[PDB]
Amino acid sequence: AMDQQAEARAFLSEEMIAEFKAAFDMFDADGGGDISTKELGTVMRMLGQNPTKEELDAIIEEVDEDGSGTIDFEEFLVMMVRQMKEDAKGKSEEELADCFRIFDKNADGFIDIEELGEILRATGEHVTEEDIEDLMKDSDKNNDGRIDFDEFLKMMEGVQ
Ligand SMILES: [Ca+2]
Ligand SMILES: [Ca+2]
């Protein structure tokens, strides 16, 4: 939708929008402003996105409700932006998992105040022992003294 399309544009820098167009145009000989739904996956992949086939199929079904077999550049930017958000969140969850495992030194599944202090101290920041204990306090939601992955994610993400 026109709304959605205006928000996809807002999300991206103008040079990036022109870089996307440059690739996109390359599959539009017609200089119609649209490409074949059959090429959608290729241009997304080229632009470093990775939709699943199921995802590709969902999208095509969503833009090709008239049967013309094409996707226009405005609709393509809405798809691109949806895929980038899904992807960036995914990396972020993956990396978080990795910071957890590392924090959990003894790999018992929990961070304790000794492991929380060690990793915070190691930063070079001047954290005092009551500053580490406050962080613990605030993040430990079931008050068992440690930080489990669930509580880790809430502490890191924030809001979370
Ligand atoms: Ca541990
Ligand atoms: Ca806890």
From Swiss-Prot:
Pfam families: EF-hand_7
Entry binding sites for Ca(2+) 4: 140, 142, 144, 146, 151
Domain EF-hand residues, every copy: 15-50, 51-86, 91-126, 127-160
A Gene Ontology molecular function term of the record: calcium ion binding
InterPro entries documented for this protein: CALM/Myosin/TropC-like, EF-hand-dom_pair, EF_Hand_1_Ca_BS, EF_hand_dom
GO cellular component, one term: troponin complex
Keyword Metal-binding attached: yes
Sorted UniProt keywords: Calcium, Metal-binding, Muscle protein, Repeat
Binding residues for Ca(2+) 1: 28, 30, 34, 39
Binding site for Ca(2+) 3: 104, 106, 108, 115
Positions with a binding annotation for Ca(2+) 2: 64, 66, 68, 70, 75
Domain of life: Eukaryota
CDD domains in the record: EFh (cd00051)
Entry's Gene Ontology BP terms: skeletal muscle contraction
Task performed by this protein: Troponin is the central regulatory protein of striated muscle contraction. Tn consists of three components: Tn-I which is the inhibitor of actomyosin ATPase, Tn-T which contains the binding site for tropomyosin and Tn-C. The binding of calcium to Tn-C abolishes the inhibitory action of Tn on actin filaments.
Something else known: Skeletal muscle troponin C binds four calcium ions.
Family: Belongs to the troponin C family.
Identification of the protein by name: Troponin C, skeletal muscle
